[PDB]
Design a binder for this molecule. Structure first.
Ligand SMILES: Nc1ncnc2c1ncn2[C@@H]1O[C@H](CSCC[C@H](N)C(=O)O)[C@@H](O)[C@H]1O
Lengths: 25, 130, 215
C-alpha cells in the first residue's frame, strides 16, 4: 500500500507529463 | 538483577542510529511512523529552511542540489514548505527568498489569517478549497 | 507514465489534469494531518524496550555490539534468531561467514530455512559450534525453523519443557513470520536478552536486539 508522500509524488509526476502533452499541443 | 528498561536505553545510545533514539536514549517513534528511507530528520528541516534564503521558494531542483546533495524528494520539499508557511497553496510565494525569521511571521500570519475565516485545518490555512 | 494508458486528446488530457489537481489537494491535507499528528506526537506500534539497528551485517562490526553488550547486560545472548535472505539477498557464503560464534557463549539458535537451504543451515550452524536439537514447523505450505544449542543450558535460566513445537499462521495467506515463536522463546527464556538478525520492523518486540538493513 502507498503512503501519502508516494501518492503525491505519482500525482505530481503525472501532472508534469500531462502538462507536457497539453503544451505539446 | 537486570533492568531491561535501562538496558534498552543504554544500548540504544551506543548502537542504534541517531534517528532511532533521542540522545535522551528513549525511542523516537516519529521514525517508525514513516517508511524506511522516507524519514525526515531535523537536520533536514533546518537544511530546507536554509535553502529558502539562498535559493527561494520555487527552485526545488537547485535546493535539493546544495543542501541534500541531490537525494531528497522535490515534492517532499514542495509540501514541507507548505507546513512552514501554514498554507496549502504556495503559488503566491513562488520565487521569494524568505529569511528564516520571515517564515515564522508568514506562518503565524497565515494561521491567524486561516483562524479568522474558519479556513484553517491542521495548523495550515487552506486558501484552496475543493 | 504509463504512456499507453494515458490520453492523447486535448479533451482527455485537460479532463485528467483537472481531476489530478483535485486529488493533490486531497492527499495534501491527508499529508499535513499525518505529519502534524506524527509531529505532536503520535506513538508507533513499536514496544518501548525494543532496540533497532539499521546496518548491513557484512559492513557491521560485531565487536561494537559485543563490547556494548558486555558493558550493559554483563553476559552474551541467550537466544539468537535468523531468517537469512537466501539466494535483498546475501550470498549463501556471506551469511555463513558471519561471526556468530563470538556472539553467544551459552544458549540457543533459531534459523529459518526453506526446503532448498534446509541441509545448508544444519552445517552452517554446526560450524557455529551449535549442536542440532529440534525443529519448529510452521504451517501456513511449510517452513521449518531449525534449533541448535552450544555450551550449557543446564542452568535454571532455561526451561526444558518449552511449548509445543508445531505453530500456525496468525492470518490466512500470510508471509511474515508468526508471533507465537516469540513466546516459545518467552517460555524458554523469560526476560532474557535476545538477538534477531535479518530483523524487520514487525519483528520488533521488546527485550530484543534487532539488526536489519530494513529497520
Ligand atoms: N546485509 C544485510 N544485513 C541485514 N539485513 C539484510 C541484509 N541483506 C538483506 N537483509 C534483510 O533481511 C530480511 C530478510 S526477510 C526477513 C523477514 C522476517 N522473517 C520477517 O518477516 O519478520 C530483509 O529485510 C532483507 O532486507
Amino acid at each position: 500500500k502507498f503512503t501519502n508522500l508516494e501518492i503525491l509524488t505519482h500525482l505530481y509526476n503525472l501532472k508534469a507529463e500531462i502538462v507536457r502533452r497539453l503544451a505539446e499541443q | 538483577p537486570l533492568d531491561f528498561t535501562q538496558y534498552a536505553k543504554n544500548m540504544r545510545k551506543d548502537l542504534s542510529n541517531q534517528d532511532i533514539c533521542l540522545e535522551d536514549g528513549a525511542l523516537n517513534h516519529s521514525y517508525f511512523l514513516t517508511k524506511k528511507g522516507q524519514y525526515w530528520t531535523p537536520l533536514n528541516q533546518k537544511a530546507l529552511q536554509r535553502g529558502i534564503e539562498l535559493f527561494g521558494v520555487g527552485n526545488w531542483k537547485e535546493i535539493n542540489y546544495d543542501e541534500f546533495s541531490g537525494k531528497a524528494n522535490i515534492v517532499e520539499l514542495e509540501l514541507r514548505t507548505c507546513m512552514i508557511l501554514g498554507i496549502n497553496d504556495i503559488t503566491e510565494y513562488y520565487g521569494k527568498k524568505i529569511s528564516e525569521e520571515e517564515q515564522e511571521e508568514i506562518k503565524k500570519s497565515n494561521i491567524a489569517k486561516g483562524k479568522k475565516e474558519n479556513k484553517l485545518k491542521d495548523n495550515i490555512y487552506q486558501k484552496l478549497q475543493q | 507514465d504509463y504512456l499507453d494508458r494515458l490520453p492523447k486528446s486535448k479533451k482527455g488530457l485537460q479532463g485528467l489534469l483537472q481531476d489530478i489537481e483535485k486529488r493533490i489537494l486531497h492527499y495534501k491535507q491527508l499529508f499535513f494531518k499525518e505529519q502534524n499528528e506524527i509531529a505532536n506526537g503520535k506513538r508507533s506500534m513499536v514496544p518501548d524496550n525494543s532496540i533497532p539497528i539499521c546496518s548491513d551485517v557484512t559492513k557491521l562490526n560485531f565487536q561494537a555490539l559485543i563490547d556494548a553488550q558486555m558493558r550493559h547486560a554483563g553476559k552474551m545472548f541467550d537466544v539468537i534468531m535468523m531468517d537469512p535472505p537466501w539466494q535483498d539477498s546475501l550470498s549463501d557464503e556471506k551469511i555463513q561467514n558471519m561471526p556468530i560464534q563470538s556472539l553467544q557463549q551459552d544458549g540457543f539458535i533459531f534459523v529459518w530455512a526453506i526446503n532448498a537451504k534446509y541441509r545448508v543451515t544444519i552445517k552452517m550452524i554446526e560450524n557455529w559450534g551449535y549442536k542440532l536439537v529440534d525443529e519448529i514447523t510452521w504451517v501456513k505450505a511449510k517452513e521449518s525453523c531449525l534449533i541448535g544449542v552450544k555450551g550449557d543450558v543446564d542452568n535454571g535460566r532455561f526451561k526444558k519443557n518449552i511449548a509445543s513445537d508445531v505453530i500456525f499462521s496468525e492470518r490466512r495467506g500470510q508471509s511474515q513470520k508468526p508471533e507465537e515463536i516469540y513466546q516459545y522463546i518467552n517460555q524458554l527464556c523469560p526476560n532474557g536478552n535476545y538477538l534477531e538478525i535479518f530483523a524487520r520492523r514487525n519483528n520488533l518486540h521488546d527485550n530484543w536486539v534487532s539488526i536489519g538493513n530494513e529497520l
